[PDB]
Amino acid sequence: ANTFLVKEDSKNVTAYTPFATPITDSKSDLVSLAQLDSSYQIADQTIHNTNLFVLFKSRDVKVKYESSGSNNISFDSTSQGEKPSYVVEFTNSTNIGIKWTMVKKYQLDVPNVSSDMNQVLKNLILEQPLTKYTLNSSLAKEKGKTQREVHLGSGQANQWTSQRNQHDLNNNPSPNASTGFKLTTGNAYRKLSESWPIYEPIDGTKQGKGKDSSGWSSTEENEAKNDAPSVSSSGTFNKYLNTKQALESIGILFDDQTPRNVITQLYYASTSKLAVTNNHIVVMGNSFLPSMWYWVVERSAQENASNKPTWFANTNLDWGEDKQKQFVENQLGYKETTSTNSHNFHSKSFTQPAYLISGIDSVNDQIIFSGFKAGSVGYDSSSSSSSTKDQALAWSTTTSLDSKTGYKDLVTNDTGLNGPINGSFSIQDTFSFVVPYSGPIKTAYPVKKDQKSTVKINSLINATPLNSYGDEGIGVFDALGLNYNFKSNQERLPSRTDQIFVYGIVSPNELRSAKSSADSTGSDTKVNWSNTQSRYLPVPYNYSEGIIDASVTTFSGLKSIAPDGFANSIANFSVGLKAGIDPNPVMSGKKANYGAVVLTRGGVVRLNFNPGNDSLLSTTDNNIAPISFSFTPFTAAESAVDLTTFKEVTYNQESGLWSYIFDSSLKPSHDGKQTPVTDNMGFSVITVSRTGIELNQDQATTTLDVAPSALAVQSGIQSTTQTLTGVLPLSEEFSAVIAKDSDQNKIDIYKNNNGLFEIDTQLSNSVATNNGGLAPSATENRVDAWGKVEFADNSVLQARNLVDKTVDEIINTPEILNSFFRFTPAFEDQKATLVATKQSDTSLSVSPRIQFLDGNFYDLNSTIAGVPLNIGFPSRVFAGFAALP
Ligand SMILES: [K+]
């Protein structure tokens, strides 16, 4: 309401005016007001139809996972552990100022676990989280057994061409195709009840213990602690990085120096973002850790009700085509009638179990989400004569070279559907990591028929959008998108399991099946979200250096030159999904346009919807890539932005521009080498605008065959020296920045000069000079924030023979009273008008109504939140007008 809510700290939210001044007594400790203890903090907030909705989470929360019995996931009741997250609706109880009062409180309870779910959860293993300091070599993992080794075994090599038909690998030209990566070295994989370490291997191909938590606690932890000690000492850092502070910064909870169990980290990370509709409150995880569930809270929920989350494993998405969904599901694990204790997500008929969510928003009563599919594959946990013992089962699903050029054809290509196929291929003198061809060429799951029942294939979840970490050449090409065909127009061959971006628009009824699925007793109930899609989105290949063509470049040897705050250049990331209604009007009879934008590594993604039926935007040609998704690359200025410092994203309906705010105080205190971080000062603002031909503009634009796009611009609003308080996007032409250059708040005004914001030092000084009041002062002789007003002398009446005219006439003739002053604007097109009041039968007084940086007009009677601004404009009485006509 011409007010800007600024989160001052973890508990307080203050209301600000367009003049970058706080409304007196508006500062509210929303934690105290929500009747929550001091361990709670604001995770997210949103306004919905005049009321504020706040998502709160506690630094004290402790969650337990017990493999035995029912109700497996539970808060640890002993001591201060049962501290669930809450969504609170607040209303403004006053008409003069801000007095927030609590309306509704919603508890976000732990998930229900069905019998089938617990069978997967008992041996579920999750990778340690990726930090700012995780290296490409840290993510690299030892290559697994080849296809020949798994199905045929140790004997000979030449018998492949003859024995492939018996193992259902008809015409497979890849006996030496990797079946996955080893879990005896590398990043730590921990059960829900176990804890991740503060140490990250420098070379995951040699250091780390993977899933061997016994070996970690018995011999390797001592080795990591002496090489990479926490600061107080000064260590070597030859084999490991100590990322404790970088973990604390991404929301990892600790007991002194020890991170709490995986299930607690998952819970606390999962209550990070909210979106509100007329009927629901939806809560999703952060873009740092994979989330396995989300909440759909019915706003009609009775006070003190435990609101249950819905599992992603039970939420079936539309991945574009059924083959795209088949690809993901087949690589989740081994599905066999004969299993015994071999339970995985594919085995128990579940779908994709986790995502790294970019964020959530709502346009109309629809929920919008995006995120990357978290890598999830099967692993062999059997112990003893097993070929794949302690090996994750992952493989490249990149399209073969012979595939037809056309989106549908490229993504439905059967290459790597059931098992491994890609690796290394040399056709005459030209090389490729991808098969050149697709009876038929068969693919089979990497488990041999003999050990069908005597194998234990359980489920793992990776920290990144990568399925396969195996230290080979295809992984780098799949991770960075360097697989192209050798055809006329060179087309990028997509993976269907690595770096898979996901998005959609979810209807109130789809949210209702989700709530029903959360509350389901006994067996699992499934939800179907049908207005969703997926897209292969690799990281830019130019965030890496010195890659080999036709010795290959692998993760363990890949040089990162990434400028966006990550030490790795292989794993994709997204942040700040924000929806926005387009202010540009559509042709009559059509519904107002809307879209959403999200930032990923190396560019901005634009999400397109059809407002007529709140569906994804589409085109009749299946060859054309779904026009619901557009990607636009960043230039060097936007790429330089540390994406891990993302503070908030706002949209302004008047301009149709998204403002992504980055705060450098969000950087961890210390390095992976325990060195203090010195560039923790400043902030940055990226502006996103729509580009391209938009739907329903005219009769030709009722159909689209080209995806509307967006453009991110590191638009000149930034500092390396100031501590940000907040950015106020006043208008397309101006933004106000409140920052501390010491301990005291200062106001800076940035002017948009043909697409580029630059500080206006004279405007900043004018707007900051408010004498402790709510608005900039209006000086008689100065061209300040309110321009400069010069009134005519009383002789103006006798000059233009207005003495014959009555006060009533003059007042009811706008063109006349604008000749009573001269207005000098402070900025171009700043307008002013005079407001007249009859003072007597022969005299009137005039007072200016002047436009501020926000484009609105202000006068003597202007208010913000019902509070009179008392700007202090001059008044002028003119006397000598006729009493009667
Ligand atoms: K002035």
Side-chain angles (χ1 to χ4, degrees):
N2 260 322
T3 85
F4 297 85
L5 298 185
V6 177
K7 177 166 144 194
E8 289 198 355
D9 52 50
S10 63
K11 300 176 164 60
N12 295 272
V13 165
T14 299
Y16 274 79
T17 69
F19 317 106
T21 64
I23 289 160
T24 317
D25 295 298
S26 72
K27 181 179 174 178
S28 305
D29 177 338
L30 297 180
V31 170
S32 179
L33 201 63
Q35 290 196 279
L36 294 170
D37 73 72
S38 42
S39 72
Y40 282 83
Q41 43 195 55
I42 297 159
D44 198 7
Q45 78 245 71
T46 193
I47 292 282
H48 188 260
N49 294 358
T50 78
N51 281 0
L52 182 66
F53 292 79
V54 189
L55 174 57
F56 296 102
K57 61 204 218 169
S58 166
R59 280 165 282 176
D60 288 358
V61 72
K62 298 189 171 194
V63 183
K64 295 200 273 188
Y65 170 75
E66 280 105 345
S67 196
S68 76
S70 293
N71 298 91
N72 310 91
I73 306 173
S74 64
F75 294 104
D76 188 313
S77 303
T78 64
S79 201
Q80 283 196 70
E82 194 166 57
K83 261 107 174 284
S85 299
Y86 283 92
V87 171
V88 176
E89 176 185 6
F90 298 101
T91 195
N92 187 18
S93 64
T94 47
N95 291 314
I96 317 295
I98 309 282
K99 184 104 123 80
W100 295 116
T101 310
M102 179 182 215
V103 180
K104 277 272 224 194
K105 197 173 187 177
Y106 305 91
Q107 197 188 263
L108 304 176
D109 203 15
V110 283
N112 275 342
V113 180
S114 72
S115 147
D116 294 332
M117 184 74 71
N118 201 53
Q119 299 269 263
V120 190
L121 287 196
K122 58 172 164 57
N123 307 111
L124 174 66
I125 237 83
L126 296 90
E127 193 175 18
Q128 66 187 97
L130 173 146
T131 73
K132 247 190 161 301
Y133 305 115
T134 306
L135 309 164
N136 286 342
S137 55
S138 297
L139 292 153
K141 276 160 202 81
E142 275 202 273
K143 265 161 90 172
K145 303 283 149 73
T146 69
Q147 269 218 114
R148 185 146 63 195
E149 291 177 73
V150 173
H151 294 118
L152 319 177
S154 284
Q156 46 187 265
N158 291 48
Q159 85 286 53
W160 174 262
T161 335
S162 55
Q163 269 202 83
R164 63 192 179 186
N165 301 62
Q166 207 231 280
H167 296 273
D168 308 318
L169 291 152
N170 302 291
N171 300 124
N172 197 305
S174 315
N176 297 317
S178 192
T179 68
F181 51 93
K182 280 151 140 77
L183 307 164
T184 37
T185 67
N187 270 335
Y189 281 83
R190 297 291 178 264
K191 289 202 198 181
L192 290 163
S193 48
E194 305 185 320
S195 297
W196 291 308
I198 65 165
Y199 310 100
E200 301 189 34
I202 289 171
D203 182 344
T205 270
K206 284 153 219 301
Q207 266 57 54
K209 285 276 178 196
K211 67 174 194 77
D212 181 24
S213 76
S214 285
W216 183 259
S217 63
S218 111
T219 61
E220 206 50 36
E221 192 186 345
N222 184 64
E223 237 57 276
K225 190 192 171 192
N226 290 281
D227 177 60
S230 297
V231 68
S232 287
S233 273
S234 58
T236 322
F237 303 99
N238 274 359
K239 307 294 169 197
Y240 294 87
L241 301 170
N242 183 328
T243 60
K244 175 193 65 193
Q245 300 90 344
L247 289 167
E248 288 180 63
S249 286
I250 60 153
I252 298 301
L253 291 185
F254 289 76
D255 288 324
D256 178 31
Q257 293 277 296
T258 319
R260 295 191 186 152
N261 58 31
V262 177
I263 193 69
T264 302
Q265 308 306 347
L266 294 172
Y267 179 81
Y268 189 88
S270 78
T271 61
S272 288
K273 305 290 170 68
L274 85 171
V276 184
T277 68
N278 295 322
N279 293 95
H280 306 105
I281 295 168
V282 185
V283 180
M284 296 204 179
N286 59 49
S287 61
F288 293 109
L289 265 76
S291 48
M292 294 196 278
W293 56 75
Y294 55 97
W295 289 252
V296 176
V297 181
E298 283 280 351
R299 288 182 54 194
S300 66
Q302 294 84 70
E303 200 52 69
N304 272 98
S306 298
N307 300 281
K308 251 69 174 77
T310 310
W311 295 83
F312 279 128
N314 287 335
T315 312
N316 296 286
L317 299 174
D318 199 321
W319 293 78
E321 302 286 338
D322 210 71
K323 209 145 274 173
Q324 295 173 263
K325 185 170 153 75
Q326 277 171 55
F327 264 98
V328 173
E329 289 181 349
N330 290 346
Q331 206 163 137
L332 285 189
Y334 186 65
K335 202 176 197 143
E336 198 62 29
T337 317
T338 338
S339 291
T340 212
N341 253 352
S342 171
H343 303 295
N344 60 73
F345 288 117
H346 193 210
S347 105
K348 283 285 191 184
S349 289
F350 289 113
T351 194
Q352 173 64 32
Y355 298 92
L356 288 131
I357 293 296
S358 328
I360 37 167
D361 206 10
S362 81
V363 190
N364 164 269
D365 247 12
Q366 314 297 290
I367 284 297
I368 302 175
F369 76 104
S370 68
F372 271 97
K373 169 191 78 51
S376 194
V377 299
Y379 80 100
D380 194 340
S381 59
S382 69
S383 190
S384 188
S385 299
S386 182
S387 198
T388 55
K389 186 183 163 278
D390 310 329
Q391 195 204 292
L393 306 167
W395 58 89
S396 182
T397 64
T398 302
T399 299
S400 60
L401 304 156
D402 68 343
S403 187
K404 296 212 239 188
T405 58
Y407 194 88
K408 191 172 184 179
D409 287 289
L410 281 153
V411 301
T412 61
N413 186 274
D414 282 38
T415 300
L417 227 185
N418 305 296
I421 195 87
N422 303 325
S424 61
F425 306 92
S426 54
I427 178 135
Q428 266 64 61
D429 274 273
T430 46
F431 181 79
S432 74
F433 294 105
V434 146
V435 268
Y437 317 107
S438 60
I441 299 109
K442 240 283 184 183
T443 38
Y445 196 84
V447 167
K448 93 140 153 182
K449 292 176 175 249
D450 297 39
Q451 56 175 81
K452 184 177 80 194
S453 47
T454 72
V455 83
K456 198 181 181 187
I457 309 306
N458 298 136
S459 246
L460 66 73
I461 288 155
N462 296 334
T464 76
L466 302 177
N467 255 26
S468 64
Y469 284 128
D471 204 37
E472 69 197 305
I474 180 99
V476 174
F477 271 50
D478 288 351
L480 327 184
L482 294 160
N483 297 313
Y484 287 82
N485 62 22
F486 302 98
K487 244 281 162 184
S488 176
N489 169 58
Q490 312 190 260
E491 301 252 77
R492 185 226 261 164
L493 275 11
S495 167
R496 272 74 53 97
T497 47
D498 302 281
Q499 320 262 52
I500 309 304
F501 185 73
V502 126
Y503 62 99
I505 190 161
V506 184
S507 70
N509 288 342
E510 274 169 334
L511 288 177
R512 285 186 187 116
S513 333
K515 170 70 164 145
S516 137
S517 175
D519 302 315
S520 143
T521 43
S523 194
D524 305 87
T525 300
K526 313 292 173 170
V527 206
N528 303 290
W529 285 1
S530 52
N531 296 303
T532 67
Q533 254 283 359
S534 85
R535 187 76 132 249
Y536 170 69
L537 193 51
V539 299
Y541 53 76
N542 65 28
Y543 277 15
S544 293
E545 206 157 64
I547 301 157
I548 317 151
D549 64 329
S551 73
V552 285
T553 296
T554 75
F555 297 146
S556 78
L558 182 70
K559 178 57 186 172
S560 169
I561 55 150
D564 63 352
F566 291 101
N568 86 82
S569 52
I570 60 172
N572 219 332
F573 171 88
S574 63
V575 87
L577 172 96
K578 188 78 188 61
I581 294 162
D582 195 351
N584 296 313
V586 292
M587 81 204 272
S588 72
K590 305 286 190 174
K591 308 210 178 79
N593 273 335
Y594 69 87
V597 298
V598 53
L599 296 184
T600 61
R601 301 190 68 199
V604 57
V605 6
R606 163 96 185 246
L607 303 180
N608 304 308
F609 310 94
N610 182 354
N613 72 323
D614 300 329
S615 66
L616 297 180
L617 204 72
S618 62
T619 193
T620 29
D621 203 0
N622 283 160
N623 296 332
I624 303 168
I627 65 150
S628 52
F629 175 113
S630 186
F631 177 81
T632 300
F634 276 170
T635 66
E638 297 85 40
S639 284
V641 176
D642 188 344
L643 303 169
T644 74
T645 65
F646 169 86
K647 167 127 293 291
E648 63 145 34
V649 57
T650 67
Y651 182 77
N652 182 291
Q653 218 172 294
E654 217 200 346
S655 42
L657 310 166
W658 295 259
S659 296
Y660 284 84
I661 318 301
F662 295 93
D663 191 335
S664 289
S665 64
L666 294 182
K667 293 181 184 219
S669 68
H670 298 76
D671 229 353
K673 294 201 188 188
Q674 295 297 286
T675 309
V677 171
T678 61
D679 64 339
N680 65 314
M681 229 69 177
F683 61 92
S684 189
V685 181
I686 283 171
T687 306
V688 185
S689 86
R690 300 178 159 84
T691 64
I693 312 153
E694 294 301 334
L695 187 90
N696 304 326
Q697 291 303 294
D698 53 64
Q699 198 52 51
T701 64
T702 58
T703 49
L704 286 180
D705 65 329
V706 168
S709 207
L711 167 76
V713 171
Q714 172 45 65
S715 58
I717 304 153
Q718 54 180 119
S719 159
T720 27
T721 57
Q722 304 178 306
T723 304
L724 188 69
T725 297
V727 174
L728 319 181
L730 301 189
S731 60
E732 187 180 330
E733 195 182 1
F734 298 101
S735 271
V737 172
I738 316 136
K740 300 200 172 93
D741 232 317
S742 50
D743 69 292
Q744 263 258 313
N745 264 355
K746 170 174 152 58
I747 306 154
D748 283 327
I749 299 296
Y750 288 85
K751 189 172 204 174
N752 188 354
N753 179 20
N754 321 311
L756 242 69
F757 285 96
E758 11 188 283
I759 193 159
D760 192 301
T761 55
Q762 290 191 296
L763 264 181
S764 295
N765 179 245
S766 293
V767 176
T769 297
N770 52 30
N771 290 107
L774 282 179
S777 50
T779 319
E780 220 197 281
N781 303 142
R782 264 204 263 148
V783 177
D784 50 29
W786 298 107
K788 169 179 184 174
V789 174
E790 296 173 74
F791 288 99
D793 187 269
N794 208 65
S795 66
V796 67
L797 322 187
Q798 280 285 340
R800 303 189 212 254
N801 282 100
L802 261 47
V803 286
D804 306 305
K805 297 167 185 167
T806 181
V807 172
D808 299 349
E809 185 177 341
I810 306 282
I811 283 173
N812 309 337
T813 320
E815 42 257 288
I816 293 173
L817 52 150
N818 295 317
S819 78
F820 293 149
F821 84 129
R822 185 215 252 92
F823 178 73
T824 298
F827 57 92
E828 217 204 347
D829 299 310
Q830 173 177 50
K831 343 260 200 303
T833 53
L834 291 191
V835 167
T837 296
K838 174 155 166 178
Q839 290 293 327
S840 78
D841 297 323
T842 59
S843 76
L844 61 91
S845 70
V846 290
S847 196
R849 188 183 147 259
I850 311 177
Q851 189 169 55
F852 183 64
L853 310 180
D854 63 358
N856 306 312
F857 284 83
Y858 294 89
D859 58 58
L860 286 180
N861 295 299
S862 296
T863 64
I864 297 291
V867 183
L869 297 162
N870 286 301
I871 291 149
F873 294 121
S875 270
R876 204 82 174 186
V877 163
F878 290 88
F881 303 102
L884 271 308

